[PDB]
């Protein structure tokens, strides 16, 4: 473990808690893409199947269980408990254009042709584009609430910290995974317009307009 990955994991947990607590306390999921929450829960489900085959650490196990529970709970609050405030009419991204090709790519381009590795690869490719329905919803509706932008900031910063972590691991440990890296740069570049707008507008008391 290095500080870049630790801050990255804590930034990811921060985003997940900000969203869950925002929906819970306000009793509303207005402005939130239910489709992106489905994709993030599907990322954790396919990535962490190794909970049954590998033990890295108590931290690694606990973080995995917390991410699965918080992702599934967010989906439960949007689609079941506070479904009266779910804006289905503005969450119109067709997720089939993400799942079917990323599924195809994970089967063809992977480190090993075995079910656990193919499923892990699917989680990596899917995560790179999982936020697309949420950004697409914000551009359609025109605005994003401040708490929603804080959620997007900490979520976007998490995989950016992972890129720094991979430079660190490559230099100090000689470890390199091109699939995680390439997907991680794709994941971060999809936040470029949001980052620019968050720093120049949101951090200056202005409207985030995608």
């Amino acid at each position: 473990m290095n500080i870049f990955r630790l801050t990255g994991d804590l930034s990811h947990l921060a985003a997940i808690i900000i969203l869950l607590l925002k929906i819970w306390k306000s009793r509303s999921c207005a402005g939130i893409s239910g489709k992106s929450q489905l994709l993030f829960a599907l990322v954790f489900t396919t990535r962490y199947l190794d909970l049954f085959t590998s033990f890295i650490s108590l931290y690694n196990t606990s973080m995995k269980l917390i991410y699965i529970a918080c992702s599934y709970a967010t989906v439960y609050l949007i689609y079941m408990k506070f479904k009266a405030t779910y804006d289905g009419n503005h969450d119109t991204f067709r997720v089939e254009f993400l799942i079917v090709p990323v599924g195809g790519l994970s089967f063809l381009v992977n480190h090993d042709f075995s079910p656990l590795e193919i499923l892990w690869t699917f989680s990596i490719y899917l995560e790179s584009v999982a936020i697309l329905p949420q950004l697409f919803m914000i551009s359609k509706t025109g605005e994003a609430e401040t708490i929603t932008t804080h959620y997007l900031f900490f979520l976007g910063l998490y995989r950016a910290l992972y890129l720094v972590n991979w430079i660190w691991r490559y230099y100090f440990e000689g470890f390199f995974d091109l699939i995680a890296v390439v997907a991680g740069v794709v994941q971060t570049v999809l936040y470029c317009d949001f980052f620019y707008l968050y720093v120049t507008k949101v951090l200056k008391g202005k409207k985030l307009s995608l």
């Binding site: 990955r5 994991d9 190794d50 590998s54 995995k64 892990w120 972590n165």
Partner: peptide, 5 residues
């Protein structure tokens, strides 16, 4: 092994 999240 995959030791990250």
């Amino acid at each position: 092994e995959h030791d990250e999240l």
